[PDB]
Design a protein around this ligand. Structure first.
Ligand SMILES: O=C(Nc1cncc2ccccc12)[C@@H]1NCCc2ccc(Cl)cc21
Ligand SMILES: [Cl-]
Lengths: 302, 297
């Protein structure tokens, strides 16, 4: 019993964090095999941040301009290439702590753990979700660039995120490990605003099923709804549309609890209308949306 | 910017998790140097049940390697299995007993394999509101100070309300609990006041000021109100501990107490603080400073 926002154990990722210094800029790199991955904005100066030409700035750099530090060991950069918004520094040593890994690009609503780092040293680990507006509500200070988001399903680390920047609202933007940004963001100081954020509906339903599995049933009702009627109500509360894929995904939880997805949708509609009334669901007074259906099953069953 | 419930990086602890099997029971062990620590309920008159056990009855597995048990002893509610091999991944460590209100990270394990890491607090009623399934016994709570892991908790059981009970690494239970199937109930819980204030300072540091007011209060008047809402008494030590946050934000601790007093008597009014509609009490003043300054390990 119990339901916590749980991150993956960060050990496999900690053994990959390095510090990447280029000129006056220092941030984090991810050392996997003989390559160090980091945000390409590490090659940027003061006046080369509003409109940087990364191809032009990178051509002027030599291998010895990049200082990579793994613990108290300086690694030797023997090559450099750019892939989208990520810089790949070929090094003369393969990381002995390289875990079994994959680069995966996630979709909004997906969760992952973040290993926040400063100067190549891990400071903390927390659980996040890719918001529908493609930002992450992380916890990052200056120097956190290069910190990574990942999932550890089985013994394989799936890297899904690399931190690049903080938007004016305090939310964060970044890329997959191939350098493709999540959302309409670019790695420059130009005016960029996150779109209006919405609640990840399928995740709220997954969390309502977690509450039922843990013995919380007060919010259940005798009603059901059509998928269309639910979405018409949901949109009015800035909730993401629930698709037939989401209904299918929630099938296992519906089978385990005996509460049909559209039946749980009618509970969610009622909660949106009434609020909680001094009550909590799994120790929360708000509807939690950073637990996917897969997270709920893993945490409640194994 | 941002404020998250953040756990310590769990790597140093992951290299210590092993699986301990005794008879039909399988749980987790903590392998430090040549000793494996685990809950004694893996084997009631525990002295008598332990005397009937031989070293080969304990099957300890570190990854795909079976470790050989060369000795066994009991210290309070923890079993210590002496093994032939010292753990090469043994970090710099200490066994520390924490006080209610203090926070720590939990590395939840099943069959000696880490499955997740979360942050939690020792409740004033000595329970932890964890996330644990069958097989999680032996999972440990810890903090990291510089490069030293301070082990503070070992999971033993789940109480009927779904909350959890366990011991320090010397086998002394936190709270009035015993390691036996019997009627045991967690006492009435209270809110960790100093932690709520620390979290209000974290909200101010992140730009949330709506709850601030022009008012201040005496420590005595605050505690009279706090006692009424099942909040822990705020001591002069807590006020001193909150000093650095008070200096950084410009909001005196008793000034923040007047904000808390109003929040208790009047509620949030549809508003949130750091994305929460409840007052968060599982961040200590040190946690807030560590996260709002970026201390690394
Ligand atoms: O956002 C960046 N860094 C940070 C990242 N996270 C939390 C921060 C908090 C406080 C200050 C900086 C933070 C990075 N340096 C600032 C300008 C900038 C502009 C464009 C790009 Cl691509 C990156 C950057
Ligand atoms: Cl995905």
């Amino acid at each position: 019993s119990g339901f916590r926002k749980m991150a993956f154990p960060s050990g496999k990722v900690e053994g990959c964090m390095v510090q990447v210094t280029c000129g006056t800029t220092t941030l984090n790199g991810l050392w996997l095999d003989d390559v160090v991955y980091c945000p390409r904005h590490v090659i940027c100066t003061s006046e080369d941040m509003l409109n940087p030409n990364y191809e032009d700035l990178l051509i002027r750099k030599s291998n010895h301009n990049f200082l990579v530090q793994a613990g108290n060991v300086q690694l030797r950069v023997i090559g450099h290439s750019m892939q989208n918004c990520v810089l790949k520094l070929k090094v003369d040593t393969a990381n002995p702590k390289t875990p079994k890994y994959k680069f995966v690009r996630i979709q909004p609503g997906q969760t992952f753990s973040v290993l926040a780092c400063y100067n190549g040293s891990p400071s903390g680990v927390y659980q996040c979700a890719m918001r529908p507006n493609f930002t992450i509500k992380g916890s990052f200070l200056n120097g956190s660039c290069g910190s990574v988001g990942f999932n550890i399903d089985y013994d394989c680390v799936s890297f899904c995120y690399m931190h690049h920047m903080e938007l004016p609202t305090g939310v964060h933007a970044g890329t997959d490990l191939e350098g493709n940004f999540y959302g309409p963001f670019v790695d420059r100081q130009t005016a960029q605003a996150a779109g209006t954020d919405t609640t990840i509906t399928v995740n709220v339903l997954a969390w309502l099923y977690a509450a039922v599995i843990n013995g919380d049933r007060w919010f259940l009702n005798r009603f059901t709804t059509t998928l269309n009627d639910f979405n018409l109500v949901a949109m009015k509360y800035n909730y993401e549309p629930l698709t037939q894929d989401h209904v299918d995904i929630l099938g296992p939880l519906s089978a385990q609890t005996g509460i049909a997805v559209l039946d749980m949708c009618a509970s969610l509609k009622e909660l949106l209308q009434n609020g909680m009334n001094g009550r909590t669901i799994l120790g929360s007074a708000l509807l939690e949306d950073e637990f996917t259906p897969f997270d709920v099953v893993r945490q409640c069953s194994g």
